[PDB]
Amino acid sequence: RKVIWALMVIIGFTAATLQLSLLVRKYLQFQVVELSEIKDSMPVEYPSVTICNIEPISLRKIRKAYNKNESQNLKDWLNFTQTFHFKDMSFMNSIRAFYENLGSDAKKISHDLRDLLIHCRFNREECTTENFTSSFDGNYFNCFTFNGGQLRDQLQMHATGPENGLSLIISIEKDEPLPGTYGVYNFENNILHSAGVRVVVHAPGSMPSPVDHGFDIPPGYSSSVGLKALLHTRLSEPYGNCTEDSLEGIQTYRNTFFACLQLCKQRRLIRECKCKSSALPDLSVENITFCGVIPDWKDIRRNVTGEYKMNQTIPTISLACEARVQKQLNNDRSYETECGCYQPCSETSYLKSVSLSYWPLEFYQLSALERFFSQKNPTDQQHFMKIAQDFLSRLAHPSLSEKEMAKEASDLIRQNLLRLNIYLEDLSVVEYRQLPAYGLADLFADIGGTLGLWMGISVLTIMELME
Template identity: 25%
Template sequence: HEAPSPEEHLQARTSPLRIEPPFCQQTDDFAHNSTLHGISHIFPYERGWIKRCLWVVFFLGSLTFLLFVCVDRIHFYLEYQHVTQLDEISTPAMVFPAVTFCNLNSFRFSRVTRNDLYHAGELLALLNQRYEIRDIHLVEDNVLEALKIKADFHNFKPRPFNMREFYDRTGHDIKDMLLACHFRGTECRPEDFQVVFTRYGKCYTFNAGNEGHTPLITTKGGMGNGLELMLDIQQDEYLPVWGETDETSFEAGIKVQIHSQEEPSFIDQLGFGVAPGFQTFVSCQEQRLIYLPPPWGDCKVTPMDSEFFESYGISACRIDCETRYLVENCNCRMVHMPGDAPYCTPELYKECADPALDFLVERDNDFCVCEMPCNMTRYSKELSFVKIPSKASAKYLAKKYNKSEQYIAENILVLDIFFEALNYETIEQKKAYEVAGLLGDIGGHMGLFIGASILTILELFDYIYEVIFPFSHVVYIGRNHYSKERGQYFTSLRKNCLLICSHIYQMLAL
């Protein structure tokens, strides 16, 4: 038996550290079998180096373009842009909206008592601080006589006063204002209107849809299929105006808001005016808006943190915020505000509540910042007008309602609200670029530039695994081998090195 050579002896002693097959061979096999285009032209060593260099340049250039496009697509995705989609959807029936209206005059002059004037006369700009009638030269004779009687405080003993009761008692009564009412051709009555308090005082809502009443529906569009009201605004009951306050009005007519049943009325900010002497046609279309939450949009997704309202909306948020602002700054609330805080007195209305609310609404842009709800319903409106009464009908209406023709012209208005068509418009925000689009773009450009796919990426991972795992396994085995036979191993290694050096020396000497 022939003794092993020094090279064979060294190879046998260091066999745990060998890597089979060689790295270059593995890379060459991967290049020939991979679905990654261009790799097979780079690694075959039998080709000329010029062709291989050209293929390297082409491959790296394509890879650079691919990386540039991928970075651009990822950057575009991280911008979280959205698009707005509009659509009109027809339906066989639609819920008719709630209609809230307020007389622009908050208090009827005939209902104001001596006790009311004593407590609120200065607030209404009727009396000065000495409880005397202001600007007598501006007062009409009949009004002055009635006001002198009410403002006679000799031997008067004031009684308790409450602003909520004052607004309720002196506000215009729907039974006196409503001359005619029809919904879809059916007569409606004062009982169909619900009292609601706003900053205008005592107001009324038709089709409020609460207290167990189902909201009314309509099955046709156009006039005659909605709500038609004839109202008397009672200008002879308007308070005389001798000064500018938040409780007095220079205008004559009503304020109207069309809103959904889930939304509280915010008529002083969102209402539109209707003047006497005109028939006003309001053609509506329901709009359902759907907004995206952050980061694509800015709608509010968290529940509303309010003790007054269950569902979130812009109007609910504003009313809640204004209420908290007044309670914090004035220790009271206005009549139209929810909660259990005490109502402001006339003095607090004038000195604190009205100035604070005016400042909040007109100048403070930081306190009441209400986010857009993710789902909301609103109604677009188109208004048109015709003059009433005509010369031909003036005498008839005057006789019918036992009023003068001048009174009819100055006090009567007709309001006609209807759907333009039996459809609604959806305005929906949609994500402009989603994960599926990002992956599709990246995958498409991978195929265009380097002919790769998801499976190609898996091939790369498999190749890396095949290269790294044997090496790590060898290192692990080598470490165990060293820890067990460290002394013997290094002794054998020194001997083998000496044998190799001796063998090389002999070869050189020859």
């Protein structure tokens, strides 16, 4: 009978409706599929290169500013920090206390880029210190960025190999200790008391993080870093919550998730107890100063009125605040969900291979050293490698007794100098692209087959049943 026909048509209608609902719910689950493809002829951008000296403070600079009539704030601060008693003494002896309590005089204790960088060369063109930008850092105090995206437009690489990349001859400015003085190994820090250079190779125009993402370079070796470029392309809403925005910080930075988290930490500190930390990115918010500045410490020194008995305890509630919040943030990981930090939509990263070779050869030491002493200030009064130049000159101009002098000169030069080549190994860029797993066109195609037929069946059945 035709009732069987009607029931048997309506069951097919139900099946078609199930198909429609299933496909629509699949399209509303905005799945993504990633595919990796090698892009050639894509212009490669040379990364930003941040170099920091592992020894944050030059002791010889302190010694000769100690003899200077000028730089009185340094004498005041040192005598002040040794005359009293402070809770959290590990911070008072740190370099962050120097930075926070001596705003401008602290540049007289650090390393200047002219002292460090004795040779630069990019793409077979000579550098100077004129296209490095300096930033303050915690526990390194200064980090100099090449290709930071501020002085100049972004550099590009059109060749491979060490010749065409960046090449630096750096002197770590190691200093000879005085005969009777010795240092104290801070057994509560995992980074201090080394020599070398901390190098960060990061995406062009992004924020550096020398402590986390850097790698060390030892003196006396030519170290080469070969880079391979990678590009990650992500999808925005509704396929994901990635963003094209850029970080603000102290200067506009290209967006990276880690730097967003660091800025979130800084904002949380500022919100909670009205000061910012030196061990975190600077923000420059009004009415806010560093967590650890002791206001009027110069007045705290000088009892014009009867006050401040020696070995006193100076109350620093801001240090306790900042330390407590640091510990809470370091041991609890819940703030991350409360302050945004979406992933960047497009992100360039690098795969690096670092390798060492012995450098420089003895036969070429003297001439190299002749450059090093003929570039800087004509005041060669005293440097760690003056003895090296004297020994090498006395060898060249007029063999055991001179074997010791050659050995000592090489030992000094290789204790102080290093070379660093950063270059692109290949110009092919491996790109990981997100795609909509089930796009709108695919759904349109899958549905258009059943649309007309089944809503036609529905129209016919509805118009027949109405009578």
